[PDB]
Design a protein around this nucleic acid. Structure first.
Ligand code: CL
Lengths: 175, 95
RNA sequence: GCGGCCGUAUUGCAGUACCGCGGCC
């Protein structure tokens, strides 16, 4: 099966996308693992890794320019901890159509200070009990979740919930 | 009823939430529809005539067909999307 | 200059300088 190589990067489309940002197109190569992204020389605002066969989000080089990650329709079930050191300015992560199962599996996303948009549509974790509430509570800076805004009133209600014994028990079990 | 469109590479979406700024509207449309295929462009204006609407242009007709079937009525910024094939071919796909 | 809340009108098939109006906090 494929490898993500420097040549694959050099031969892929590298273009101004519909929202005026610099995008690398890595869609549809059945890539099994992230590697060699250092060869992008931090040129891209956006990397499109849709329609591959990633099982984990990991192995990122330092890419301070990277602000949007498109990860549609992979098989991701784990995110490596500490990725904010590699991609600190990540503003949107689009994980539609993956295999993230539990609310604790989203723990690795907490240290991104600028992450304002998340999609977990068509992931098992998006129908876990307390999903939207938990996300409001755990990610204070998150603004758009599955393309519905987290309103201040939503975050207030979530924080009030997790101060109850019921909510406390929910948090206990997530850990 | 009006005449139905054969599948086209462009979908037309209306009933969009008009409070959303145009740049953010296009950004979020790009993200949610990127699951279906390569997107060639998005055309959205906020004039009186064209606000609340967007055209999403896919490279492949198959991608548009899945987008339409899958996202019909999806609550995007808390309004359900109304999606149809566009009534004409988009300029950017001209031969 | 920068926001929050509430309401109201347009449901419209396009290719963009920009994009409705009003009330409260
Ligand atoms: Cl066009």
């Amino acid at each position: 099966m494929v490898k993500l190589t420097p040549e694959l990067i050099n031969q892929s489309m590298q273009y101004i996308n519909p929202v005026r940002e610099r995008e690398l197109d890595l869609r549809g190569y059945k890539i099994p693992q992230i590697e060699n992204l250092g060869a992008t020389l931090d040129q891209f605002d956006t990397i499109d890794l849709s329609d591959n066969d990633l099982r984990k989000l990991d192995n990122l080089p330092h890419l301070p320019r990277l602000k949007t990650l498109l990860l549609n329709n992979n098989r991701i079930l784990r995110i490596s901890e500490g990725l904010e050191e590699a991609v600190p300015n990540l503003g949107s992560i689009i994980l539609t159509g993956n295999n993230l199962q539990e609310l604790s599996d989203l723990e690795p996303l907490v240290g991104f200070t600028k992450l304002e948009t998340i999609s977990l549509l068509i992931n098992p974790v998006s129908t876990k009990p307390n999903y939207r509430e938990y996300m409001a509570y755990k990610f204070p800076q998150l603004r758009l979740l599955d393309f519905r805004k987290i309103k201040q009133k939503d975050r207030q209600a979530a924080q009030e919930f997790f101060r109850t014994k019921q909510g406390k028990d929910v948090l206990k079990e997530i850990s | 009823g009006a005449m139905e469109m054969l599948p086209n590479q462009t979908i037309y979406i209306n009933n969009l939430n008009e409070k959303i700024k145009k740049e953010e509207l296009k950004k979020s449309l790009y993200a949610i529809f990127s699951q279906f295929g390569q997107i060639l462009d998005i055309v959205a204006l906020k004039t009186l005539k064209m606000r609340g609407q967007a055209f999403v242009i896919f490279k492949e007709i198959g991608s548009a067909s899945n987008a339409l079937r899958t996202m019909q009525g999806f609550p995007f910024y808390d309004k359900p999307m109304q999606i149809a094939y566009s009534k004409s071919d988009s300029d950017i796909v001209a031969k």
